[PDB]
Amino acid sequence: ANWLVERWHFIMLNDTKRNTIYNAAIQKAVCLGSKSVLDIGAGTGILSMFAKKAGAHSVYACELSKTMYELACDVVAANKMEAGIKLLHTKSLDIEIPKHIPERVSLVVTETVDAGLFGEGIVESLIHAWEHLLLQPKTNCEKYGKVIPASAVIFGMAVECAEIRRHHRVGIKDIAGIHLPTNVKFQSPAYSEPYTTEKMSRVPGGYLALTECFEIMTVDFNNLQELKSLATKKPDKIGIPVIKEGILDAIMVWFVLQLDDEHSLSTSPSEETCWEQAVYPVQDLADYWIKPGDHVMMEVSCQDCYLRIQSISVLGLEQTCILESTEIALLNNIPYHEGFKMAMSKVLSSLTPEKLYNILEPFYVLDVSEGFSVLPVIAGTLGQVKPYSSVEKDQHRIALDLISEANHFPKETLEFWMLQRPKSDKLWSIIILDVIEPSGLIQQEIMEKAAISRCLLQSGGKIFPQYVLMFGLLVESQTLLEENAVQGTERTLGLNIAPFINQFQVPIRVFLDLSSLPCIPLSKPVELLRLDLMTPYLNTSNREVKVYVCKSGRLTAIPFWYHMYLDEEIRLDTSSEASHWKQAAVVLDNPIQVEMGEELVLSIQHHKSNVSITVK
Numbered sequence: 001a002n003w004l005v006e007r008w009h010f011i012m013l014n015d016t017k018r019n020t021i022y023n024a025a026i027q028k029a030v031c032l033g034s035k036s037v038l039d040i041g042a043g044t045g046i047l048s049m050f051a052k053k054a055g056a057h058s059v060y061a062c063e064l065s066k067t068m069y070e071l072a073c074d075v076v077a078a079n080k081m082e083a084g085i086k087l088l089h090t091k092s093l094d095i096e097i098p099k100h101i102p103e104r105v106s107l108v109v110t111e112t113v114d115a116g117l118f119g120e121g122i123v124e125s126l127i128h129a130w131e132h133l134l135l136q137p138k139t140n141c142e143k144y145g146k147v148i149p150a151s152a153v154i155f156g157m158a159v160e161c162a163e164i165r166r167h168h169r170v171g172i173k174d175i176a177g178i179h180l181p182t183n184v185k186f187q188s189p190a191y192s193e194p195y196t197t198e199k200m201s202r203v204p205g206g207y208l209a210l211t212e213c214f215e216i217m218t219v220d221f222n223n224l225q226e227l228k229s230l231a232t233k234k235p236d237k238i239g240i241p242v243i244k245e246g247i248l249d250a251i252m253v254w255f256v257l258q259l260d261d262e263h264s265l266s267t268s269p270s271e272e273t274c275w276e277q278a279v280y281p282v283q284d285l286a287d288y289w290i291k292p293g294d295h296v297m298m299e300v301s302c303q304d305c306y307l308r309i310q311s312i313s314v315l316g317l318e319q320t321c322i323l324e325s326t327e328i329a330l331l332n333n334i335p336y337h338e339g340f341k342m343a344m345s346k347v348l349s350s351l352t353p354e355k356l357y358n359i360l361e362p363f364y365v366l367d368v369s370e371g372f373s374v375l376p377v378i379a380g381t382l383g384q385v386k387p388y389s390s391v392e393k394d395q396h397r398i399a400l401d402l403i404s405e406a407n408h409f410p411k412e413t414l415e416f417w418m419l420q421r422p423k424s425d426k427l428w429s430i431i432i433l434d435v436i437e438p439s440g441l442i443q444q445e446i447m448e449k450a451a452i453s454r455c456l457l458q459s460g461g462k463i464f465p466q467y468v469l470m471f472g473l474l475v476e477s478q479t480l481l482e483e484n485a486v487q488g489t490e491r492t493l494g495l496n497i498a499p500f501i502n503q504f505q506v507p508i509r510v511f512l513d514l515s516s517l518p519c520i521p522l523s524k525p526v527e528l529l530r531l532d533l534m535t536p537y538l539n540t541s542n543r544e545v546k547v548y549v550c551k552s553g554r555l556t557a558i559p560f561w562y563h564m565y566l567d568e569e570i571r572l573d574t575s576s577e578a579s580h581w582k583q584a585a586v587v588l589d590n591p592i593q594v595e596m597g598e599e600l601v602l603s604i605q606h607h608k609s610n611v612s613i614t615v616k
């Protein structure tokens, strides 16, 4: 996509409460005398229009992004405020007086905050603003400089959350007959990306508070000296008592943002708010079980942009292998590995049963999975197998050589691998291909790789998976609608933004965590498509699917996922609880009213790795 608008813009603009408190704070500050305003990171320009409507004499809005800047120019002009608001395509750090802005401003308004508060560089931007773009602070509001937000209190809480854990810690020491040795320590990219961002009010499986909430930091955005002192401030060593028995999985962080002395915003987890929380995963501990009487220790600092929580330990009453969170979720996906072990054993049993646990001829197995994979080690433990790994990273090879060694493989049993024959005049008995992206879409050129792979197979040899079924269902989801499009002008307090920003939406929502999404089912899930790697003649380009509507409702989306068939009996589900793949959905531009008992027709168009789903 050439012209992107980030998904969080739709969610935020749809949050009437957020828009109300920001407009209330700006109205109060403008009416009190702050007549010259600078909006840092204007987005659509909503805070600038609030300032001008409140009665500001001069409004300047700066926007880093070319796309957001151009959109903001059109929104402001459509709201008849072209003459009153001056939009600037620049980062606020590059603004010079009188070159870009003629005079120092009395009020800075900004929303350049993330779940961890500091992740968008609010400190660096406000230090530059106080030094070069703002009037002197208070010792009449027109005479002195002020910032919205005024201040913040940052909170933390130790939690048990199995959903976070399966993405940052490998939770088992034995997978599908293979041992994962102690001398190989797996760690996520958050180990020392200090935190991920999560909607903890709806996290799959939920979370449990193991401690009470605690203050981790405070910051005064109107205090330049306090802001400059952050770069060299020594970390704050804190000790938190444990109030509940449980597995320590993360420190969940949120903040209370004080816009002024009357108006405050909380990012505390709630299904009533749009705000996500900062999640600091707990890893590299000897024991994760914590009980009342224990103390959770950590070091909180904010010297180089991001808020950091380091040296996490529990105070009572070896090769390191960095993996992506998708690869850790993969190692924690037991049905995937057990399914692959059983499917590989059946191929070995049908082709060479004496090899299952020419004597010089091994059963050749190629794993073309993308990223870290242990499938070649599982294959090697099964029989007289010559397995090949496609890992690129040197650290991954070392780890796999140590895993191979722990599974009694003599040196160079496992080898590291364009699709070609194992050896000139030799054929593969098993080829594993990566068909579904973690995004929930089909991998690019998979049909082409399958066609090339089929020519390299021994008679009776198999490509894994053999075929993939795409499943989908009709849903009424107001949540998917509000994360895809701004719902009117009432949400944006009379301002016309929705028609202009809604144009930058994409038809397919990827990386969807379907189980955490509030949905009303309007149909039962049904097979939409068959992607056959062993028998492409069974594929269909153009198909109409008649979906029985079980329940009357407003159809807003068609979520979809897959059943990957390793053979006729063994299938993997990309929507399963332990799945390391995310799902996806076709979200409708205009929701359709459907009635119980009708057969809705979906048009499913398949060309190579593309699938188009529309209501016919």
Ligand SMILES: Cc1cn([C@@H]2O[C@H](CSCCCCNCc3cccnc3C(C)(C)C)[C@@H](O)[C@H]2O)c2ncnc(N)c12
Residues within 6 Å of the ligand: 008, 011, 012, 040, 041, 042, 043, 062, 063, 064, 065, 068, 090, 091, 092, 093, 111, 112, 113, 114, 115, 116, 120, 121, 122, 125, 267, 274, 275, 276, 277
């Ligand atoms: C530093 C800077 C940024 N920019 C521009 O402004 C925006 C930066 S902010 C990034 C998104 C923040 C959303 N945070 C919401 C949130 C918070 C907490 C919890 N949950 C959320 C949810 C769940 C809702 C995402 C962006 O348009 C940039 O191009 C600037 N332009 C001019 N000069 C500058 N110095 C800047």
